[PDB]
């Protein structure tokens, strides 16, 4: 491979359902903080959750994140999906001056 950070181009979930996202990064970023932000513009990004750079799973409301440094891929999990969650998100990596990010498009379908 060659791109520093990777992820699915798009992900789909069902209303009240659950969806996960896997972002793979290359050697070197294992210790950086990892996060899931909402919004297409990186500047006014809406950070939903993030790790402290360790492998501890961190959860905030309906979003949890856990970094698997051996596999060099962190997993973002969104529970109890809502139709308003559909948006463009970012899988971001960051620490002491550096950061990478790749957008993931989230789609939500309804039942009833």
UniProtKB/Swiss-Prot annotation:
Glycans are attached at residue 71. Disulfide bonds join 23-91, 37-45. It is found in: Cell membrane. This is CMRF35-like molecule 1. Belongs to the CD300 family. Phosphorylated on tyrosine. Acts as an inhibitory receptor for myeloid cells and mast cells. Positively regulates the phagocytosis of apoptotic cells (efferocytosis) via phosphatidylserine (PS) recognition; recognizes and binds PS as a ligand which is expressed on the surface of apoptotic cells. Plays an important role in the maintenance of immune homeostasis, by promoting macrophage-mediated efferocytosis and by inhibiting dendritic cell-mediated efferocytosis. Negatively regulates Fc epsilon receptor-dependent mast cell activation and allergic responses via binding to ceramide and sphingomyelin which act as ligands. Residues 4-109 form the Ig-like V-type domain. Highly expressed in spleen, peripheral blood leukocyte and monocyte, and lung. Weakly expressed in thymus, heart, brain, placenta, liver, skeletal muscle, kidney, pancreas, prostate, testis, ovary, small intestine or colon. Expressed selectively in monocytes and monocyte-related cells. The chain holds residues 21 to 129 of 290 of the full protein. Interacts with PTPN6/SHP-1 in a tyrosine phosphorylation dependent manner. Interacts with IL4R. Residues 4-112 are extracellular.
């Amino acid at each position: 491979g060659i791109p520093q950070i990777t992820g699915p181009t798009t992900v789909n979930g069902l209303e009240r359902g659950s969806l996960t996202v896997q972002c793979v990064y290359r050697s070197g970023w294992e210790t950086y903080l990892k996060w899931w932000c909402r919004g297409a513009i990186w500047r006014d990004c809406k950070i939903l959750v993030k790790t402290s750079g360790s492998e501890q799973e961190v959860k905030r409301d309906r979003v949890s994140i856990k970094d698997n440094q051996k596999n060099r891929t962190f997993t973002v999990t969104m529970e109890d999906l809502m139709k308003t969650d559909a948006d463009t998100y970012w899988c971001g990596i960051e620490k002491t001056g550096n950061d990478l990010g790749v957008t993931v498009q989230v789609t939500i379908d309804p039942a009833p």
